Amino acid sequence: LKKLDAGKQIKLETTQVSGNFGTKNSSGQIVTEGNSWSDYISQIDSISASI
Amino acid sequence: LKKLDAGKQIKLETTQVSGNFGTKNSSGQIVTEGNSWSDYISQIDSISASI
């Protein structure tokens, strides 16, 4: 608290993010449950180059 | 609290809303479970224009 009040600044970093995506079942409904993007982050980062 | 008592006004702004819709199963029973409008909000706002 003393360091905060002295003038030092405090920063926030986005360590990670998690969330689902939307697919289709037999019907026309869009389902987003148990479809975590975290399942594909590593593979996509491994086999692709960023621009 | 001092700012509140001085005369400043505090506002409430809606950020988002979540809720289900109703479909029909094999029977005539209306089912509203795991049917979140959040699955369609992004697509509907993306492909349509508001009036």
Partner: protein, 103 residues
């Protein structure tokens, strides 16, 4: 015999109270790395904090320290960021690691 007595008094008091069972709290700044051949999903380690020859406590990363993805040859806090904090002890991330006065 009459008498009038006026009096003024100032007092300054300081007080330090301390419990000697939960005499301090600790948190750690740690970082996960991988050296195998395959990626690991939803990484969670069980770790031991030990002081001299006494294991201070065993902590399992409950929900705020779970590494979603670990690719081979890469850390979970990918290089450039800062290490992660490890303070909470109980399951629902509401407690802090206590140490007594001797420790």
């Amino acid at each position: 015999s009459t008498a009038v007595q006026d009096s003024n008094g100032e007092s300054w008091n300081t007080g330090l109270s301390i419990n000697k069972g939960e005499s301090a709290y600790i948190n750690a700044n740690v970082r996960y790395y991988n050296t195998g051949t395959a990626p690991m999903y939803k990484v969670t380690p069980t770790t031991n904090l030990v002081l001299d020859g006494d294991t201070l406590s065993t902590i399992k990363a409950q929900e705020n320290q779970i590494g979603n993805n670990l690719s081979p040859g890469d850390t979970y806090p990918k290089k450039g960021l800062s290490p992660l904090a490890l303070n909470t002890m109980d399951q629902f991330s509401s407690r802090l690691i206590p140490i007594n006065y001797d420790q």
